[PDB]
Symmetry: C3
Subunit: 154 residues, 3 copies
């Protein structure tokens, strides 16, 4: 629900090990990032963090915004949110992405697609392949490493 946890921790972190220290919700961006990636920023409608986003049009008084969604309305993938300005960082669907995305509440090689709420689910229109299994961060919060490369063909 938030990039940074709302409640402050009561304990320090044990910074000794180096394994399995990347399965956190505050892991913004992608696991493998190219210097030739196209990155945009939009006004955020809701909390579309780590979800497929779509274009949301108001009454014309205010500019275009982005909200979590999928299906035929999918426009990109949100990889970061600046909360002070409400700015959602979006990687366009034309550009391929590899990273941790929210999964609907799954094995490597299974084909995934974005549902109505911008959540990955097992399969049609979007090329997404899971590179790992679901990792549970909360009772309803599951993340999964996936590679999204364009849109499929009907």
């Amino acid at each position: 629900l938030m990039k940074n946890p709302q409640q402050d921790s009561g304990l320090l972190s044990n910074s000794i090990d180096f394994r399995d220290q990347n399965l956190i919700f505050s892991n913004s961006g992608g696991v493998c990032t190219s210097s030739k990636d196209k990155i945009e920023n939009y006004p955020a409608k809701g909390y579309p963090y780590k979800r497929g986003v779509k274009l949301s049009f108001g009454d014309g008084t205010t500019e275009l915004e982005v909200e979590a969604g999928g299906g035929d309305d999918l426009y990109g993938v949100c990889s970061d949110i600046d909360e002070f300005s409400g700015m959602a960082t979006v990687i366009p669907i034309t550009n391929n992405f590899t990273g941790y995305l929210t999964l609907k509440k799954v094995n490597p090689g299974d084909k995934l697609n974005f549902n109505q709420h911008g959540e990955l689910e097992k399969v049609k229109s979007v090329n997404a392949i899971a590179l790992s299994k679901a990792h549970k961060l909360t009772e309803d919060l599951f993340i999964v490493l996936a590679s999204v490369f364009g849109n499929r063909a009907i």
Copy 2:
């Protein structure tokens, strides 16, 4: 049918207003431009300016060129033209473009497709969404702000 108007105006322009000054036909490129965008150039066959283009092949003596077109042959979007060299600047369909494009003689949010002449029309195989109403520059020339983000 030229980016730069041929008939030079008889009056000086008044630079007093900062609103509604970009709704001209000589506004080449895009409104939102990324420094990592891929930009190609090709020989132009006709005037494909501000239209969707397709690859056209000749007899074989000369190289391939780009001509205004759509359908399943759509290759990219022509954003600029150098008239001296007849060189059309193309953004491939694999790259996403946001800018003013020619509309066939539509409200923000309407899905659009490219016709046989590279003109956007209201609706199948291209992701084009109108971001503004049709602005009429000439009695037959209409433009529209559209974001293209690939195929469907």
Copy 3:
């Protein structure tokens, strides 16, 4: 035995991109035309500085072929192997044999260059097969810009431009 050895060397060197081979003479190629029709040619005829290029461990010999992702027992990371159809992931534009690393351009980025063809005139529609070879026609926008050039009794290359997916 040695003749069979030499025959296998010939086969594997024809398979390879730039095999090591000593020559008794200095071959002279003074003309500057049709000098680029070699198997050791660079990945792209027209290359942009904004192209996204990845590298992956290779399974088999996917050079100048369409590549797809493949997974094993999970002990080792995913690897690219020659393939096409609906499983196509990218195009292998280079290979480094010492490190066994295939340099690949994803299907989300348009590519133009010489690719392996099935054993064709310009302006024809091409599709990737199960082996990653191009064949005359589909779900990929691949168009041939030239005719098939034959370098070996089974090796054909063709100049092709591939730009994204083809809806419907």
